[PDB]
Amino acid sequence: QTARK
Amino acid sequence: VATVKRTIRIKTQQHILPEVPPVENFPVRQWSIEIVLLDDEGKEIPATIFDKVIYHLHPTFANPNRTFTDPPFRIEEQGWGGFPLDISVFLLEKAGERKIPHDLNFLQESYEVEHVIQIPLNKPLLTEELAKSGST
């Protein structure tokens, strides 16, 4: 849920 | 400029697409953003004060600048990473562009963010339109 690019 | 203030509400939803192979073990998600205007009582109403809305997406997306002209200016995309973005909203009658910062993230299944913008009172058609959402 904390995935960033 | 003489201006009035209005609050717009940005609405985001996202969910995992399990049929899409995860990329580096990160799932790919479908997500959407829409924009509504709030009236002076706080009810959502169509954001007809905008001529067009451009989502300036992260440069990894194909054609990252997506233009919409009909409320609620709903965009739908797929991806695996959250990112900050700017939403350009173009007021009616060339009254001006406003850049609204948003963050697209996966922290919740859906979440809403409100932003106050200052809108000039020097374009009669926009001024008339603004009366639908509060005093002018």
Numbering used by the authors:
A (entry chain B): 5 to 9
B (entry chain A): 2 to 137
From the paper:
Lysine benzoylation (Kbz) is a recently discovered post-translational modification associated with active transcription.
To elucidate the molecular basis of Kbz recognition by the YEATS domains from Taf14YEATS and Sas5YEATS, we determined the crystal structures of the Taf14YEATS-H35-13K9bz and Sas5YEATS-H318-37K27bz complexes. In the 2.0 Å Taf14YEATS-H35-13K9bz structure, H3 residues from Q5 to K9bz could be unambiguously built. The overall configuration and binding mode of Taf14YEATS with H3K9bz are almost identical to those of H3K9ac-, H3K9cr-, and H3K9bu-bound Taf14YEATS complexes. Taf14YEATS and Sas5YEATS adopt an immunoglobin-like β-sandwich fold. Both histone peptides are docked on top of the β-sandwich and are surrounded by three loops L1-2, L4-5, and L6-7. Mutation of R8 severely disrupted the interaction between Taf14YEATS and H3K9bz, reinforcing the importance of the neighboring arginine in ensuring binding specificity between Taf14YEATS and histone peptides containing RK signatures (H3K9, H3K18, and H3K27). A π-π-π stacking interaction composed of Taf14W81/Sas5W82, the benzene ring of Kbz, and Taf14F62/Sas5F63 dominantly determines the specific recognition of benzoylated lysine by YEATS domains. Mutations of aromatic residues involved in π-π-π stacking (Sas5 W82A and Taf14 W81A) completely disrupted the interaction with benzoylated peptides. Similarly, the Taf14 A63P mutant increased the interaction with K9bz by 1.4-fold but did not affect the binding with K9ac.
